[PDB]
Each structure stands twice: as structure tokens, then as C-alpha cells.
Amino acid sequence: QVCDVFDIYAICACCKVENEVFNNYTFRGLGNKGVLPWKCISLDMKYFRAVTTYVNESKYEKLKYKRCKYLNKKKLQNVVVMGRTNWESIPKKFKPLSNRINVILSRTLKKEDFDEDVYIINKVEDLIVLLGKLNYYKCFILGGSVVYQEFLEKKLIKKIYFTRINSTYECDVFFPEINENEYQIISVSDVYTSNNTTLDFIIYKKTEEDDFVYFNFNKKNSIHPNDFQIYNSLKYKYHPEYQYLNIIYDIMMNGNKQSDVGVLSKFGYIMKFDLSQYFPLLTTKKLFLRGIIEELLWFIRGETNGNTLLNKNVRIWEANGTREFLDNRKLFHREVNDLGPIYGFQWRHFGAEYTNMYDNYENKGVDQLKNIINLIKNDPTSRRILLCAWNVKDLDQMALPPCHILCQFYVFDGKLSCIMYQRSCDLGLGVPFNIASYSIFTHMIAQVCNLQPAQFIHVLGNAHVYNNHIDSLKIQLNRIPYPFPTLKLNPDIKNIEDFTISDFTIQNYVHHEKISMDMA
């Protein structure tokens, strides 16, 4: 195959184009009015230069050998191929592309029409003849859409280096629909922010050593890894959603079978999400945030009245407030939906005597939420900046003891990080919401303290997958994450108590379709 002999690759960047359904074809915008749809995305410029300039002299020998064999026979550079329209779009000061052998496809222009150190070729076949005559490492097709269409059509592309630009622009030219039977995603990068958009980089592919063994001399759950074909097919799984999906995989393959309803469990994990780069709302199924933002606002108001959330059509706590649920807790003297001294009460009134959900607890008990905001502002190197919901004295009065034990804060160089320790983690249903809740809370605390958010760090104690979620989670693990969305806060909010639901916007959420974790 000519793409394998001559190492022909495509590299492109695609944005989104003007109950949405998402698929890989979501990312297809290439151009508008003969230029790019976006103003500079500097990180993609940096990636593009690194990929198209990188050469490995030690691997050249084998490539020269392979091409000589196939053909019957100063510094090494890559070849870059551009359509004439692409070429004319590039600013003069960037042309010819530095440290690369520049090739232009044109019928209307000939070598006499160019001042620059470029090769002009007038048909695809003449590129292959040219590649036979040059010393080069790899050949990158740089676009635009006519050039990509014809090279993909002729199966002349070994891999596509595809930048997913997670923002929407006016486009008039599009990357061709990639045929799923001809090209497979094999690698996915980390998620980044550049020039007020998130993006990632994916790769489509055409469809002492003895001592390691010795140390390995001493190396289950009716899970069939051929149930995880796509998941196990990927080479590089660098997208941060894989911190979650890898824990699911680990519990399924290595988990302990336990009772209450079956689970598989393991003990002790950590996930870290870079909130400066993305908002980690899972993309491998559809999540909604209205409920968990109302929950957080209800916590911050210090409320324990389940009816407040129910009147907003938020049902997160409904089951924990029923007559039957409260009586099974021995809370015979608790009104329905009076959840007792749970999160909000502990955050604003730790150590106060709970009475009922209607009482006015003003200036009763410890306002640890106000205290941690004061420590972050006035004593940011403190190792005591903890917010703790696990009030040992009050546990049996709560509808149930908190899962989210504590949040600890860390301030360095004007940036806020947060650790949340979770004693009990429902990986299939609860953890995706819990990541989103404490990520939003970190943003709120950072803003009211005039800081930038850095990391949300999630520590999982008892980490379990319900046996009833296994089939749904096998479906999810075989989906490839999309670049994450971004969270916007109203910058006018200066105090933790002053946020309302319209002060939060999730932008550029691209996701696979919703999953029922339990299939009735």
C-alpha cells in the first residue's frame, strides 16, 4: 500500500458548524471564505508545527530501505502537501513552511508563478513520483477540503491527526465524512483550553528486558474483555474521562463481589481534573446539571427541607425523605422530607442542636463555609482549610450519613485546588454527578476568593459498581469521550451566598446519548 511505503498522513483541525444528536461528524468545519473559521488557536498551531516538523533520523534507515525495496533499488525533513487555495490563504511571512519540504497541488499555477522554495505538482500520481526521488521522513497532507477528499478517497492516508475544536463557527468548507469501516480512532489526547475554547487531538488509523520478566515471575468476575473491544483497541487513552472509565474497568476486572443487591468493590482511588483546562462533565453518556446546581445552592443556604428541592422538580433527595425511609431510619418523630442535620446544616451550623427543617439557626453552631472562605482569603497557606459534613454526633439524626465526607483546599500562586474524600462511591450513577458538583463548588469558592480554579481531586474510599449497572457500563466503556465543555460563572457574584441558577452556564457540551444504568 502506497500510504505505508511513503508514510502519507493527513493533519487537520475541525470545529463544530452552524436535544442535539452528536457523532464524530459533529467536528467537520475546516474553513470560511478562503481562511480559517476561527482566529488563532495557538495550542493547535503549536501541535501542528510539532507533528509536521518532527523527524527521527534513527528510524530513517528502515524507511529508505523500505522505499528502495518497493521501487527496486543536511537535516532530514518531512514533506508537507497543500492545495493551491490553502497555500494562497497562508500569510507570506509563514511561507514556505519552515524546516519542511513544501509541495503545492495546482493546475492553474506552474513553477514560474512562485517566488518561493516550493515544488509544484499537477496531479496526485506526480506526488508519488516526487516522494520516490526525495530523502524525507513522513509526508503530511495539510488540506484543504478538495485535497483531503481526493487523498481519503484513494486510501492514500495511513493516519489522520485530527484536532477537535470544541466551539461553533460559520464554515463554507468541511472535512469529508470519515468512513468508520476504513478509519478507526486509535488514540485520544488530554483536553486543553486555548483562546477561550476547549480542544483535543485524536488519531484515526486506516483499519534490562529479561529483568522485567523475572521481576514479573509472580503475577475472575465473569467479565469477558471481548465485551470491551473498542476500549481495549485504543493505544493512548489520555483524555481525563479515562480516569473514570479506567476505574470502572478495574472494578469490573479486579473487583470484590459483596452484598448490600450485588456490587463489585475496591478501596482507594484518586482522580484529578484540571479545571483551568476543562469542565469534567462526562461525555460518554448525557448528564444534566440543573438538579445538582440547585442541590449545591440549597446546601449553601444551610437548608434541610426536602420540599424546597421537590418544588423545583429536583428529586435527588425524594426517596430519603419518605415516611417509610425515615421510619426505617428510626426517625418516627421526623416530618416527611425533613432530612435532619445533613450537608447544609453541617456547613453553616456544625454543632448546633437540630430541631426541625423550619427553625431559624442564625448564629447557632459553626459556620465552617464562612470560616474556610476567610482562611482562603486571609491565610491561604493554612493546612486547616477543611469543610467537614461527617458530624459523628448527628449521624443517626440524618436521613443518611454523608457520602462526601470533607473538602480540603490548597492555594498556590493565586490558584485554588480542592480534594473531596468520598466514603462510598456508586461509580455507575453517583460518581459522574459528584465530579460535576465539587468541580462547580471549586469554581464558586475560587471566584468569591478572587482566585483561579486549578485542580479538583476526587478521593474514592469504598468504590463500587452495582451488578445491575454492568451491561450499561460495558456499553459506555466502548464509547470514545468528546472534548469536555466549559463552565461560565457570572463574574458579578462576589459572595458564596449570592449565586442563583442563572449565574451558571455549561457551554459546548458534546456527548453520547443518555444511558439507563438499570435496564428495568
Ligand X SMILES: Nc1nc(N)c(-c2cccc(Cl)c2)c(CCCOc2ccccc2)n1
Would you please indicate which residues are annotated as catalytic (active-site) residues? 403
Instruction: Please list, residue by residue across 457-470, b when 16 or more beta carbons sit within 10 angstroms of its beta carbon and e when fewer do.
Output: bbbbebbbbbeebb
Shortest distance in whole angstroms from residue 478 CB to ligand X: 27
Cα–chain center distance at 286: 13
Other CB atoms within 10 Å distance of the CB of residue 234? 18
State which of residues 2, 128, 134, 406 lies at the interface with a second copy (CB under 8 A): 406
Give me the half-sphere count of Cα atoms (radius 13 Å) on the Cβ side of residue 502: 1
Q: Distance between CA 123 and CA 342 in Å, rounded?
A: 72
The closest of 280, 262, 212, 257 to 440, measured between CA atoms, is: 280
Instruction: Decide: residue 157, CB within 10 A, 0-12 exposed, 13-18 middle, 19+ buried.
Output: buried
Q: Which of residues 354-383 bind ligand NDP (CB under 6 A)?
A: none
Report the residue numbers after which the chain has a gap, meaning the C atom sits over 2.5 angstroms from the next written residue's N, or none. 18, 73, 207, 219, 260
Cα–Cα distance between 244 and 265 in angstroms, integer? 15
Q: Which stretch binds ligand NDP (CB under 6 A): 2-10, 79-87, 176-184, 364-372?
A: 79-87
**CB distance 326 to 336 below 8 Å:** yes
Asked if 236 is part of the footprint of a second copy (rule: CB under 8 A), the reply reads yes
Query: Which segments are annotated as binding site?
Result: 13, 30, 32, 34-35, 84-86, 106-108, 123, 144-147, 150, 383-384, 403-404, 422-424, 426, 434, 464, 466
Candidate list 19, 58, 72, 108; residue touching ligand NDP; CB under 6 A:
108
Question: What pairs with residue 83 in β-bridges?
Answer: 105
Q: How far is the CB of 165 from ligand X (least distance, A)?
A: 9
CB of 78 to ligand X, least distance (A): 13
Q: Is the distance from CB of 27 to CB of 162 less than 8 angstroms? A: yes
Does residue 146 touch ligand NDP according to CB under 6 A? Answer: yes
**Of a second copy, ligand X, ligand NDP, none, which one does residue 45 interact with (CB within 5 to 8 Å by kind)?**
ligand X
Residue with smallest beta-carbon separation from ligand X: 13
Which of residues 36, 245, 385, 444 is near ligand NDP by CB under 6 A?
A: 36
Specify the amino acid at residue 251: I
Asked if 82 is part of the footprint of ligand X (rule: CB under 6 A), the reply reads: yes
Residue 330 in contact with a second copy, rule: CB under 8 A: no
Binding test (CB under 8 A) with a second copy, winner from 1, 34, 40, 46: 46
Q: Give the binding range for ligand X (CB under 6 A) out of 42-50, 225-233, 378-386, 490-498.
A: 42-50
Nearest distance from residue 55's CB to a second copy, in Å? 9
Q: Which residues bind ligand NDP (CB under 6 A)?
A: 12-13, 30-31, 34-36, 83-86, 89, 105-109, 122-124, 142-147, 150, 173
